[PDB]
């Protein structure tokens, strides 16, 4: 009508920063021939506006001059995705015919007025992604025809009103990302049509109501990231349409209810980051639809039940960071669909089961800091789908070349501190995308296959603390992405290869505790990321090369326990990030360079058991050093009023 149109024009005249590319260019002639056919966002019935849809039209303004008293037939209103600021007026509740009301994705502030409950015909209420605050008014519970309420991503506080139990047609309730508090009202459980209930990311406290067992139609129950407490009520097992139950990151205590096995539709169960205790009920094995079972970061004890072999759709099993113990039953890995088996940080014992990877799809197997033992099952040897294998801290055994097969998609493998023996196979080269190969402190013997150096994606290679022999070849330069190279604690012999000079991504290099002979390569001067270099406990000889003083990022340099001789270069002053320097147990002669006074970052220094003489340089590390940092030298002398076990200088 002319009156409706002119009122909307007056509201439009108040908008700011409007750019005349606006769709509202079409709002000009208030007569019905224009208003009801050509005004953008306006639809009419019998010459009167019933729908106003200005979603995402770049409007900046407020509802201060919205024509509440001039649009009596407003039935659908969508003002979402604009720059409307200010508050929500009580006057919105005078639109008696309103069925659809969306003010989402704006910059609205203030409280939701109770008058919105006067909208007795409302089907959908959407106010998401604003900065609305205060409590949800109890009068919202008068919306007896509403099927969807979404007020997520606001600043709401206070409790969910118990009047929400009167919303008998409610299907979807989305209140996540607020600061709602108090207990969930038990009246929520008596909503017969409810399908989705998302209350996650709030500050709700108290126990989950046992009335939730009356929610026979709910398929989605998200209440993660709250402060819910008490035990999960056994009545939750009567939510027999649930597809996804997420209660993670709460303060729930007590045992997992055995009645969860009653939910035959349940595909996703997230209970992690709670304080759930007791044993895993064997009835959880009866959740026939379960795909994604996550009960990590709890306090569960006892064994994994054999009934997990009935979970034939299982894909993800997260059990890490619990106190589970005992042998694992073959059923735990029996799903042919299993891709992720996460058991780290428990106290499991015994062998891995021969069911593992029987379906050919297992990707990530993580077992760190359990007590597993025994040989690797041949089905894991043959598991070509593996991506991430973490065995650190267990006691698996056997010949490493027989234990493991070929893994084309392997990304990461850590076998640290296990009990494998034998020689490394060239088969590892087939993991062309492997970025970490960690085999520390096994009983590996024999040579490093030359094919290892063609694993050009490697970033971390740790073969430390084995009994590996042989010489490192110049083709070590081929691993050019290597950042952490740990070959320490082996029996490697021959000279350190000059090819290390080309490993310009190196940050951490440990070749110590080997049988390396001959000189430190003089070309190790261009490793601009190298902060750690340990060549200690070898048979390295001749002089310390000046190129090392160009490794500007070095923080620790340990060359101790070698046969190095000659003088300490005064160019050490250039290592301005050097914090720890160990040259002890060598054959170094002459004076400690006075240029050490330049090394203000140095905190730890040891030059003991050399053939050095003369005064001690003036820097904090030398002043703070204990007498054994200097003992065993030829003619060192100190200064009075600083005891370090030296005869004073003349």
């Amino acid at each position: 009508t002319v009156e409706e149109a002119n009122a909307l024009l007056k509201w439009k005249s108040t908008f700011t920063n409007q750019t005349s590319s606006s769709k509202l260019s079409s709002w000009v002639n208030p007569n019905t021939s224009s208003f009801c056919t050509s005004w953008y966002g306006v639809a009419c019935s019998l010459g009167s506006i019933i729908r106003l849809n200005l979603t995402n039209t770049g409007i900046e303004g407020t509802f201060e001059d919205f024509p509440f008293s001039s649009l009596p037939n407003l039935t659908f209103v969508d003002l979402s995705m604009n720059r409307f600021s200010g508050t929500i007026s009580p006057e919105w509740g005078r639109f008696s015919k309103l069925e659809y009301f969306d003010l989402s994705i704006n910059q609205l502030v203030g409280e939701i007025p109770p008058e919105l409950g006067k909208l007795s015909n409302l089907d959908t209420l959407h106010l998401v992604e604003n900065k609305l605050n205060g409590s949800i008014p109890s009068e919202i519970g008068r919306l007896t025809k509403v099927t969807e309420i979404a007020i997520y991503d606001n600043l709401l506080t206070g409790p969910i009103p118990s009047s929400f139990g009167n919303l008998t047609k409610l299907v979807n309730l989305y209140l996540f990302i607020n600061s709602l508090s108090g207990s969930i009202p038990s009246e929520i459980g008596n909503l017969p049509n409810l399908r989705e209930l998302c209350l996650d990311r709030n500050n709700l406290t108290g126990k989950i109501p046992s009335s939730f067992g009356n929610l026979k139609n709910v398929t989605l129950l998200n209440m993660f990231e709250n402060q819910l407490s008490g035990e999960i009520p056994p009545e939750i097992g009567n939510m027999t349409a649930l597809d996804t139950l997420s209660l993670h990151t709460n303060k729930l205590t007590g045992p997992i209810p055995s009645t969860l096995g009653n939910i035959k539709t349940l595909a996703v169960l997230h209970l992690y980051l709670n304080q759930l205790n007791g044993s895993i009920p064997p009835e959880l094995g009866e959740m026939e639809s379960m795909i994604d079972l996550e009960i990590s970061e709890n306090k569960l004890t006892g064994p994994v039940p054999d009934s997990f072999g009935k979970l034939t759709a299982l894909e993800w099993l997260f059990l890490r960071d619990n106190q589970l113990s005992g042998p694992i039953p073959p059923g735990i890995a029996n799903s042919t669909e299993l891709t992720v088996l996460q058991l780290d940080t428990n106290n499991f014992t015994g062998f891995l089961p021969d069911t593992i990877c029987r379906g050919g799809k297992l990707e990530n197997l993580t077992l760190d800091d359990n007590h597993f033992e025994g040989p690797v099952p041949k089905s894991l040897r043959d598991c070509k789908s593996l991506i991430r294998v973490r065995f650190k801290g267990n006691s698996f055994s056997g010949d490493i070349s027989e234990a493991f097969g070929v893994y084309p998609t392997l990304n990461f493998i850590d076998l640290s501190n296990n009990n494998f023996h034998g020689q490394l196979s060239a088969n590892w080269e087939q993991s062309q995308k492997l970025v970490a190969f960690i085999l520390s402190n096994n009983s590996i013997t024999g040579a490093i296959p030359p094919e290892i150096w063609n694993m050009t994606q490697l970033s971390q290679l740790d073969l430390s603390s084995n009994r590996i022999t042989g010489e490192l070849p110049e083709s070590i330069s081929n691993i050019n992405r290597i950042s952490k190279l740990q070959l320490n604690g082996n029996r490697l012999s021959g000279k350190i290869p000059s090819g290390i000079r080309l490993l310009t991504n190196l940050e951490y290099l440990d070749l110590s505790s080997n049988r390396f002979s001959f000189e430190i390569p003089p070309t190790l001067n261009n490793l601009p990321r190298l902060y750690y270099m340990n060549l200690s406990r070898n048979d390295l000889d001749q002089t310390i090369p000046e190129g090392l003083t160009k490794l500007s990022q070095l923080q620790m340099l340990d060359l101790s326990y070698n046969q190095l001789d000659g003088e300490i270069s005064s160019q050490f002053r250039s290592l301005q990030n050097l914090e720890r320097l160990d040259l002890s147990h060598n054959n170094l002669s002459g004076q400690i360079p006075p240029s050490f006074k330049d090394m203000l970052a140095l905190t730890h220094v040891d030059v003991s058991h050399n053939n050095l003489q003369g005064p001690i340089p003036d820097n904090a590390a030398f002043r703070n050093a204990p007498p054994d940092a200097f003992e065993g030298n030829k003619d060192l002398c100190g200064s009075v009023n600083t005891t370090q076990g030296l005869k004073p200088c003349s």
Partner: peptide, 10 residues
């Protein structure tokens, strides 16, 4: 504009 929330895996 309205989505149900999504629980993330651990």
């Amino acid at each position: 504009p309205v989505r149900s929330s999504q629980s993330s895996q651990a």
